[PDB]
Subunit: 333 residues, 4 copies
């Protein structure tokens, strides 16, 4: 993680859908992972309390540490979530608060999707934990994160482990990127309400008529760079004005169009260390269907994993590997 | 059309590719069209002269008028080109200049793809034409257009029907959008040279340390709206910093990543009349392989058509119909 | 009041200066006012309670209601301060909290300048009051306000009457505009660290050399509009980069040059109700000299009033009227 | 000379005024200068060819070379003019065109002001010279310039010595800054017609209500940097929306308010060499009164020089020195 943008939408088909880009410097080993009922999830890597998950879920994540680490995903009850980067804001304890279990920041999604249904259930879950400053071994250190969840009803919350403790925002707009805090970007929105689909009227200066070059002038002032605040604005504004999806397939299509204003080609963002920071995959999930969808930097063809198609009582993780090959369809040889 | 964005790139394997978005109000009947050798292209709708075309080509177009109308394409000799909108600038005669033939703006691509090989041939063919104000029955007027072309060698030109005549730009940057003229955007680039992939350094204000929120701060000042001028900067600047493509396939993918910065969702742009202006399709073509590739608003899976696999002496247009259903690969039962 | 911008600075010779624009709809009856010691200042306009002020002070203000309303000023002990618009963010109570007395928002500056020396005195002072939702016979309701103070030593604080309580900000950057909160703008600074005095480097695209139009390109990204957020960034950044003032006169000059980036001409900003919102005056204060300096929309020559020049035990307010005529010096017979 | 912004305006009083900031990297010796009729101004600094000037004029300039060099000014018949930097575009000849004299770029304002009445006179005068690459100025290469003139009637033109020859633009908006060329900025204006005094309408994202911070949001998309193109846009847009000046004083006041959005404080712009580029003075001039007005980086009080006050058949240049000291009026001891 060194970036992601995320949003949810609601179709006129009464379906809730959630999507996120994931931006990074090289693709570690990641796949679509289905975690079955009762598989059990660690709280901490350095202690063996395993929490038993009532619910099966499907998500993108990693199988490299003790328990599956999910980056986003949706569960068998329609709860959807993601963990996103929160640099220079995320604050974690050394010690669990009186009467909470310690939890590794990288296990939050996995634990939440494994046992929650509603955003309230999540709020209640989280305040029984303390996010702890424990390293991990796929990345080396404790990554600064925040979290977004959307339940089948389409309510979104954002959970943010700030300096002063866990900040929680109820019924958000359904947009989240990276730092700063949710209330900062929400406030930022008010600066940009003049950003619309509609052209400004022509004007005159003295004798001179002034008309726009073509279309899109309504959007003047929207920023084009790939910072988190600019990313937030674009995803929010394009989410407000892009037409309602009529069904789940359109929902995925629209989700990836909105996200495309924030998709990063290899080379256009370099980190301090000269590492190239780019959009590795783009994912979408639907609460009602429990389908999970993803396309990759190298393959814009969308793939799909249906959670309910599997044996939710399986002994073992079920996984699907990435196909990083552009899946071009040949219309003649 | 209402808008579009285009660019060309060169792979490290000596291929040239060109790609464009097509932005429009609603989608008329468009498909991919192979025009065979010797098929014939009309110059004008109101006159019946049909110019025999030497070359076969493939691209995106309409078959609603007398001769196939091509929006972009590549021909059997590796000439690539496109017509894009040029609102407020395009200017057409009522009548041909002495010793030129009249040509409808919407036939320029089909004529040129059918009869030219190199950037210079394009220039030469054009001085034998005069663009006329002739309408057509898909649109009802002559749409204001300008044109771009890229040959096998990777040279790009822009051709602009201006108030004072055809302006030609030789050896361009390989980017073209819509109005204003090409010199204006080229100059406009200079205002944004500080937009780079690299982050700026922390500063202090008094006691206060100031650091960026994440990455991407290098690009501060780039505009994010979908006007022609902002599209031009985005495609030009992201053409500059995007990693060189190593082969044809990666060239296609790179092209659509770059064009993603300027892909318009349905609803985000509306015309003075409240019609939504959105990216209907996105296409790419390679001069060396003569493959055409495209994906749709409703389908992000790339399709490909190979000009040279067909019979270039066919009697009839060979055409491939859009598939408007999101082509999702089921990894288990869905 | 519908807006203003403020900053403080420090000179080479150890002097602290504070400056503000005032932006408004109408030019109201406003003057420089010297309040002597022991004049007595109401706390609440609908009540008869008066705190007897220990300190004399000078700033711009109104004599419309029972006690002088100061919009900014410096006192004889070197405390500087100002009230500014805090729209959509200022929250007041109907009744005082246990142990405090109510105070009207437009009395804050008067009370504080009348009774405080350091920013810490200001913080202490304030915990014995609760800002009340009390209106006035000048604007017809309690204006949404926030406050800034800078003491002799150059330390600045912001105080913000938020929904959740009074928010103090200690050791600030010494810039304040309007909404939103100081924490938001402080955070917003980080998005703009790439705005510098330094040109970006030339680049190429293909064969094309690209170089700035002139000077100034290191500022790409700074916004030019008159929103509070945009004005904060212009005042903060131009505060960072504009040279240190060597003495008091240069401080005033520099402060007004910086403020000039946020001066509003008549007509460029209109309210919802179609009222013109423009900068009526600009003032600076100096902690060490206790001079007050000001200029007006129609008068660009700066005036000064010296607090320490007057009898500080006067019975009566001392006041100086605005000279609203452009004060042009004729160098020969004009 | 290193940058400048200019505009002209027309009062309801039926008066025409013109104004300009001047940017530069230190204080040069510059005064306001009244050139009497029949004084004599060279064309070329390296030939002693004198042109007798029919008219008298006042403006800001330098006496450091043989004939006075004026940066701007107004003559006794109501012609106002200025020269402004035009870097990377200004192109001049080595040799005059058959039938023309060589003129130094730096002498254009002085020659014109001393011999022309109308903007048509300027267009005509100019076809009898070729601008030349004369170094010195013992400042030494001829600086890259373009020119604006506005006559008593309120018409403005721009003259640009381009690669393809001299370009004239007639009936301009009466805004000019620096590079690029005039039609490039005129076209640029079109991208910003959405910049208005009027606030945008509040909107909703879901349940969340969004309203501006304060006032001024109509301006979103106006850049606040000091590049020539940003300056061009701030002058033109604030020229368009600033209230009409109702008399000559208001005109001067209004011009300095508009120019104040482009006034450069010392330290905020540095050159590729790390010199500081700042606004040394701002001036205005009225075609009908023939008054010259000016204020300084260090002196916000406006001074005025009246052309018609002097003896216009004077033998000698009449001169006023800058007063570089903040002219603060003391209202008490």
């Amino acid at each position: 993680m060194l970036g992601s943008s995320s949003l949810s939408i609601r179709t006129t088909d009464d379906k809730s859908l959630f999507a996120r880009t994931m931006d990074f410097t090289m693709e570690p080993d990641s796949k679509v992972i289905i975690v079955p009922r009762n598989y059990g999830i660690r709280l901490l890597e350095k202690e063996n309390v395993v929490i038993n998950n009532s619910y099966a879920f499907v998500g993108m994540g990693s199988t490299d540490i003790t328990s599956p680490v999910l980056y986003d995903g949706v569960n068998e009850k329609g709860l959807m979530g993601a963990m996103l980067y929160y640099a220079t804001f995320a604050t974690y304890a050394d010690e669990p608060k009186k009467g909470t279990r310690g939890i590794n920041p990288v296990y939050v999604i996995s634990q939440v999707l494994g046992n929650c249904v509603t955003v309230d259930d999540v709020i209640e879950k989280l305040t029984s934990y303390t996010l702890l400053n424990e390293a991990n071994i796929i990345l080396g250190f404790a990554p600064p994160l925040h979290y977004t969840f959307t339940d089948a009803s389409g309510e979104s919350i954002v959970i943010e482990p700030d300096k002063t403790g866990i900040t929680i925002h109820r019924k958000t707009i359904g947009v989240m990127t990276n730092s700063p805090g949710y209330e900062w970007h929400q406030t930022n929105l008010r600066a940009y309400i003049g950003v619309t689909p509609n052209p400004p009227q022509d004007i005159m200066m003295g004798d001179l008529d002034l008309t726009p070059f073509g279309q899109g002038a309504g959007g003047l002032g929207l920023p084009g760079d790939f910072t988190p605040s600019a990313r937030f604005l674009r995803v929010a504004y394009w989410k407000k004005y892009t037409e309602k999806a009529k069904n789940e397939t359109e929902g995925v299509t629209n989700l990836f169009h909105i996200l495309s204003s924030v998709n990063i080609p290899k080379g256009v963002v370099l980190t301090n260390e000269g590492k190239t920071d780019y959009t590795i995959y783009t994912s979408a999930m639907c609460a009602q269907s429990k389908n999970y969808y993803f396309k990759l930097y190298d393959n814009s063809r969308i793939s799909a994993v249906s959670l309910m198609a599997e044996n939710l009582n399986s002994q073992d993780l079920i996984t699907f590997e990435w196909d990083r090959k552009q899946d071009i369809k040949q219309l003649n040889q």
